[PDB]
Every structure is written in C-alpha cells, then in structure tokens.
C-alpha cells in the first residue's frame, strides 16, 4: 500500500542525502578555509562585520566537520559512532542554522549603521561590542536548541522523528518563530530603513537583499516540512501514505536548508573591502617570494 514511499525514503537517505551532503562538505570546507585563512593572513584590523563573518565561518566548520559521519551512516544505513556524537552532531547542525541567520541579522544592522555613520562613532559599531554580541548569539541559540534534549526520549534519528509529537510541534513552531521568522523580519525591517535613507539622498543593499533571499528560499521548505512532519506523527493525523509521503518531502528539504553552510561564505565579498583582490594579491606575494631573494637584495643593494 505504502511500500513505494518506503522504498523511495530508503533511496533518498542512502543516495540523495549522502551525495548532497558530500557536495556541501567539499564546497563548504574549501570556501570556509579560504575565507578563514584569508582573515588570519590579510585582515589585521577587524570591524563589526569582520567579527560576525569570522563567527559565521566557525559555526559552518563546526557543522561541516560532522558531515563525513552523516554521509557514512546514510550510505551504509547504520550509525556506528554512538549516542554522545549523535547528540553533539544534532546540536551543531541546529546551532549552525540559527547562529547563521542571527550573524547575518547583525551584519545587516552593521551595514545600515555604517551607511549613516561611516566613521563607526557609535558603541554598536565597535569590534568589542561585536565580540560580546557574538558570544550572546552562541548563548541564546544554545538555549533555543537545548529543549530538543527532552525530545530525545524514545540509530541517529532526525529531531522530527523522536519524542511526543504534541509537545514537539509546539517547540518546533516556537523554534521556527524565534530562530527563523523573527531574525528574517528583523533583516527585512533593516532592508526597508536602508532604502528610505538612500531614497532621501545600491551597493550596501546587496548583502541584506541576498541574506533575505538565501534564508527565505533555503529555510522556508525545511521549516514548513519539519512542522508538517511532526504534526503527521500525531494520533489525530489521517491514516494512509500521507505520513510516508511527508517523510520523503521532509528529507528532500533538509540538505537544501544545510546548503547555507556552503553558500554563506559569499557574504565576505559583500562588505566593500575588496577582500577578493586582497586574496589574489597575498597569493601572488607568496608566489613572487619564490623567485625574489629579499635576504640577498638588502645585503647587496
């Protein structure tokens, strides 16, 4: 009766999740090490945007480092890493989703403030303030994700599969609101304010428009399906293949939401500093150091 949806669900986990997470792992690992090493080698004086972007990259690397375990468990259909790594991986996955959109919310507020006060005279525009905020994003998101621990009761299942669906749906709905929808509308609010400032007098709008687009498109199918998935586990939910179909649709959306960790290093090239030009120049300086002998140039000339 629902054997087709069941065979499909197994195929989706075995081949689709493992191939899509595998691409995210390569793209994400390369892009995030490029920009991370780029900041540690090129950037000597950091502003608010630099701090958040760097933090966004730590959040991505924390999640991307768990992907080889997920890929193997899906490809073989068995979790061999034990309970603790299962819990800690579920945490970094969700901590990445929610710290990511918050880091972008704070970059958008930085870009708006910089538009009005380019000399960073205000307390909210200082790098010491950015560090405290960054720490507060890590503390807040950890506390938002912590109630998931109560749902773990009854190999390494997705949060939407474990615990009482009645309580889990409420929590999921609050987590969608606090973690996704409110930071998204805050960016939209700051997008509107930037437009009003510009119309009264396009480059600073790029970052906010792109962040609203990327998060709207990547997080919406995942967040709708996660709430539909949990609701479909309720006793009051109708009988049939609907539950199995929803399981399949939900699985398709998960790597789409997690694409964030591979595509969000793009925000480093939208802060007006010519970072790309700095990357090639520094790379050229390491290539030109091979031929040129500065130890002999100073000694003879």
């Amino acid at each position, epitope marked *: 009766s629902c054997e087709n949806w069941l065979a499909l669900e197994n195929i989706l986990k075995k081949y689709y999740l493992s191939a899509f997470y595998g691409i995210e792992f390569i793209v994400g690992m390369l892009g995030n090490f490029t920009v991370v090493f780029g900041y540690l080698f090129c950037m*000597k*004086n*950091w*502003n608010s945007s*630099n701090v958040y972007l760097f933090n966004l990259s730590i959040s991505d690397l924390a999640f991307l480092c768990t992907l080889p375990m997920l890929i193997r468990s899906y490809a073989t259909g068995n979790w061999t890493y034990g309970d603790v790594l299962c819990i800690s991986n579920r945490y970094v996955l969700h901590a990445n989703l929610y710290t990511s959109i918050l880091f972008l919310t704070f970059i958008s507020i930085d870009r708006y403030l*910089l538009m009005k*006060f*380019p*000399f*960073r*005279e205000h307390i909210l525009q200082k790098k010491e303030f950015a560090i405290l905020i960054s720490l507060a994003v890590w503390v807040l998101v950890t506390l938002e994700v912590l109630p998931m621990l109560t749902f773990i009761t009854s190999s390494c299942v997705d949060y939407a599969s474990s615990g009482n669906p009645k309580y889990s749906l409420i929590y999921s709905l609050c987590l969608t609101l606090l973690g996704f929808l409110i930071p998204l509308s805050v960016m939209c609010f700051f997008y509107y304010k930037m437009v009003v400032f510009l119309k009264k007098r396009n*480059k*600073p709008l790029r970052l906010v428009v792109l962040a609203v687009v990327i998060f709207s498109v990547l997080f919406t199918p995942y967040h709708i399906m996660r709430n539909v998935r949990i609701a479909s586990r309720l006793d009051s939910w109708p009988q049939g293949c609907s539950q199995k179909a929803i399981k399949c649709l939900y699985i398709l959306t998960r790597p789409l939401a997690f694409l964030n960790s591979a595509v969000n290093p793009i925000f480093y090239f939208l802060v*007006g*500093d*010519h970072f790309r*030009d*700095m990357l090639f120049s520094k790379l050229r300086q390491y290539f030109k150091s091979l031929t040129s002998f500065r130890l002999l140039e100073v000694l003879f000339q």
Partner: nanobody
Amino acid sequence: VQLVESGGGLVQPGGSLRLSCEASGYTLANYAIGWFRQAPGKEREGVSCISSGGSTVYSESVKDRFTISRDNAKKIVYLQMNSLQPEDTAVYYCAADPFGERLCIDPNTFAGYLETWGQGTQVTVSS
C-alpha cells in the same frame, strides 16, 4: 603615489584653515582621499573622505564645519575647516585608496589597508 599635506598652523577658536593634500607627480583621479587626525596620546580618528566618484563623508565631530573637495583639474584634495575649536588640535594626515569607491564606506577600518599616507601637518587651535 607620494602624498604631502599643506596648510595648518596656529588658529584662534572660531577661526578657519584650509588644508591641502597634493600628489606632487600625478593626479588623484582613480583614488579615494581620506583626512585623518591624531591628537597626542589619542587614537587616529577619521575626519573626512572623498570617493573617486566625488561622494563626501564626514565624522559626527566635524560635520557642518568641514568640507572636503577636489580642485578643478582634480590634482589636489582640500579640507576647509571652519569654526575650529581647541579639540581640533591634532596632526592632520591624508591617505589615498587606489580602490576609489572603497575607503569612504568605512574610513577608520579601511585606512588600515592603505600604504600611501602623507607626513602629516600640525593644526593648533589656541587663543
């Protein structure tokens, strides 16, 4: 490009000074120019910036008092300083960003990326 600042000296509170930033051998056309100041023991503070596109930015401390401009041929950058107060006493420097549309977005951060600076010119406001 080699930069050199002119103008500046003693001025009475309420007085005016016009500083000049010249690039002795070539045009400041493809460059963004920033005016920065440093009082003894204090941190370097951005005051004003002009983009290659002619856009102008001013710090909250000098807005509605200072005017940055480029001459007719656009060879020199000027900093007109009106209603000068003792708090404007500092060594004033100019800096040039070859990415003409970059510097004035974030002058205090992006100044850290710049290699071309002038020697500085002393401005003293006292009665």
